[PDB]
């Protein structure tokens, strides 16, 4: 029901398996996953995106913008490339 993702700095994020499978890499690789290059401040945003994508899939109303700060945009893009998101 729940999967646990470990950040490079040791932070642990527990998310619903359905949300986690949004990432092709996670689905292919999987009750726990570990990343050696994704920092916590990026993995938290990735989990936020999992929730946001699951909520607003096939929505009939306007989908609100996903907030990405310029500081993490580069690392977030790299992480999204590593995953399949």
């Amino acid at each position: 029901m729940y999967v646990k993702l470990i950040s490079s700095d040791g932070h642990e994020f527990i998310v619903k398996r359905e949300h986690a499978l949004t990432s092709g890499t996670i689905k292919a690789m999987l009750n726990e996953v570990n990343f050696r290059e994704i920092p916590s401040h990026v993995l938290s945003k990735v989990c936020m995106y999992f929730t946001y994508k699951v909520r607003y899939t096939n929505s009939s109303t306007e989908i609100p913008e996903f907030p990405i700060a310029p500081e993490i945009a580069l690392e977030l893009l790299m992480a999204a490339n590593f995953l399949d998101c």
């Binding site: 096939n58 989908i63 990405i68 310029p70 790299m78 490339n81």
Partner: protein
Amino acid sequence: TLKPLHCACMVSDADCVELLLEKGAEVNALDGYNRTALHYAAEKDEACVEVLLEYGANPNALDGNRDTPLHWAAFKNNAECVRALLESGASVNALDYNNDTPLSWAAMKGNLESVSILLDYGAEVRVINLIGQTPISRLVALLVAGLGTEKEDSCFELLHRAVGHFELRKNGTMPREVARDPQLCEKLTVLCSAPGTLKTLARYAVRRSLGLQYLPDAVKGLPLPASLKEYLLLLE
């Protein structure tokens, strides 16, 4: 109405404009229709544009409706003129009285090359004019009319990659013209109902943070791999 330099620009002869400028001609002089010689040069040829720019011509000169020469170069689809103007300091997001940017005019007619160059120089796709139109909306209006070809489809793909996510539905219904086309309506509803991949949104954020630059040069200095550098430039 118009002055000899304007006529030289209209007839598209670099020699005449160059020799006229060689005797201190008023390069930024207005005329009967409130345009400048650079407007005609942008509308006509890139050699005249280069000659005029070499002699201090203002690349952001305004006309009766506050349209810069870049607006007309993009509308005419003079890709070389667009590149020459942008390379000399032209504003890529200049707004006219209707709040129409050059990219909006380029997308109105589905000009692929001009759109590509404007995006390469940091043009904003998430822009709306006074009557609520956006470049993607205008391109879709062109497409639903049946006047589009493979070039227009490629332009739509480019704009879709550049925008990240778009919404054409007012309230919860597509416009009347789109709604009456079962195929394009289905395609656009499927596109508009998807939140958007994280990679696309991150690319949009990175590009926006780079705004108003020659993006292919800027991305060269980033620590990204080659594949992500190509991705950031809408090449995939």
